[PDB]
């Protein structure tokens, strides 16, 4: 019942990552691991606390203490970034509790910074009776940005909608941000601009009317 | 090697029922029974019953107990998975996965997993708009132009620009799910601005459940 884990855990290569799982008193109970890339199926990686299948690599072993079980993947290398989960089988309800997932990060990549374009409305869209403002961000790392709009200068919280990051054909992270408005509104606030901060560092694009 | 190959993706709307199939290759069905798992997007997983190949008793989670039912066939080495009463919050992957009597107590083997979309919106053609570069841009440098893919309800939009020859710059981004239920998406180039007005930027918006074959030109901004 209620497996627990930290979101996030960042180990550089070489160094062991020991993704902890806490559950209420976690006695010798049948703890198993999986593992989950972007886009495919969890993958069995540890089982019966510290057992492994066949063909998962020996760095993998697992630990299942007192109150917390831990996976340790030592040597950690940068094929193994993915999300991995805990699991036991609850008695009291008869159940299959998953963990809440851990996103391993592994690092070997500078900090890098966003590309931020930006595309008013089109002459085509207005002429539709629509107004819908284009923030892409591309070319950067840490997978987290936080984005906010600005409206001439004047703070905005309304009509914008914003994709999460991804990987690109590059190892760096890239994510969309939209903006739909009122055609009254485009043309009397004299420029728009997409505010994009990514770890603390803000970049900016200009443009007005025609 | 055992293998669980799932059914593609389904596309249903709230209030409806959905079935997904996990076949087992190979040895005999009824040998070792296997499981279901849902994981809502970027969530994480979530478990939601059993079934026994042989004893086809089922066992299920109190989440989804009456709504699910899971069934199995003998004859094509399948298993079931149906969800009654379809809501908007089951937008997942469901994935099948088999436990082998004996080694031990996880799932040695998974499924590829089947998207179920899940809203109220209909299947819709794509709107296209395009995109003007930096209106000045004469001695500038580098510029982005692209298309704006707006409003459709199925996400497999699919871009390219003139018939495939461009390909330097091209970042085509995924799509967002605006909070009526609806897609919209953006591709965008990157080029030098000295050619300006000597090739060419057309690009083909394709919606094949629509058949929607769209081209939109993106000159510079006029």
């Known amino acids: 019942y209620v497996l627990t884990q930290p979101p996030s855990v960042s180990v550089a290569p070489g160094q062991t990552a020991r993704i902890t799982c806490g559950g209420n008193?976690?006695?010798?109970?049948?703890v198993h691991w999986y593992q989950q890339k972007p886009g495919q199926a969890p993958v069995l990686v540890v089982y019966?606390?510290?057992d492994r299948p066949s063909g998962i690599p020996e760095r993998f072993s697992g630990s299942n203490s007192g109150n917390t079980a831990t996976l340790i993947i030592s040597r950690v290398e940068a094929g193994d970034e993915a999300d991995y989960y805990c699991?036991?089988?609850?008695?009291?309800?008869?159940?299959?509790?998953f963990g809440t997932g851990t996103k391993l990060t592994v690092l070997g990549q500078p900090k890098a910074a966003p590309s931020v374009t930006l595309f008013p409305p089109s002459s085509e869209e207005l002429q539709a009776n629509k107004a819908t403002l284009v923030c892409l961000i591309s070319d950067f790392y840490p997978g987290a940005v936080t984005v906010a709009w600005k409206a001439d200068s004047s703070p905005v919280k309304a009509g914008v909608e914003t994709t999460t990051p991804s990987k690109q054909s590059n190892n760096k992270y890239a994510a969309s941000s939209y903006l739909s408005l009122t055609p009254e509104q485009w043309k009397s606030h004299r420029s728009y601009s997409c505010q994009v901060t990514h770890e603390g560092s803000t970049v900016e694009k200009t443009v007005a009317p025609t | 090697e055992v293998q669980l190959v799932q059914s593609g993706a389904e596309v249903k709307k709230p209030g409806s029922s959905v079935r997904v199939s996990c076949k087992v290759s190979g040895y005999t069905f009824t040998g070792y029974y296997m499981h279901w798992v849902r994981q809502a997007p970027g969530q994480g997983l979530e478990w939601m019953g059993i079934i026994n190949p042989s004893g086809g008793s089922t066992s299920y989670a109190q989440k989804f107990q009456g709504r699910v039912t899971m069934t199995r066939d003998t004859s094509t080495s399948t298993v079931y998975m149906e969800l009654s009463s379809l809501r908007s919050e089951d937008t997942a992957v469901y994935y099948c996965?088999?436990?082998?009597?004996?080694?031990?107590?996880?799932?040695?083997?998974w499924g590829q997993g089947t998207m179920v979309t899940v809203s109220s919106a209909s299947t819709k053609g794509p709107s296209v708009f395009p995109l003007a570069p930096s209106s000045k841009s004469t001695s500038g440098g580098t510029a982005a132009l692209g298309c704006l893919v707006k409003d459709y309800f199925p996400e497999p939009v699919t871009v390219s620009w003139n018939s495939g020859a461009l390909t330097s710059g091209v970042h085509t981004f995924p799509a967002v799910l605006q909070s009526s239920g609806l897609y919209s998406l953006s591709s965008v180039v990157t080029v030098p601005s000295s050619s300006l007005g000597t090739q060419t930027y057309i690009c083909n918006v394709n919606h094949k459940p629509s058949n929607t074959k769209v081209d939109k030109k993106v000159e510079p901004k006029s």
């Open positions: 699991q036991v089988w609850d008695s009291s309800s008869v159940h299959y509790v």
């Open positions: 996965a088999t436990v082998r009597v004996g080694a031990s107590d996880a799932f040695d083997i």
């Open positions: 008193n976690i006695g010798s109970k049948s």
């Open positions: 019966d606390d510290s």
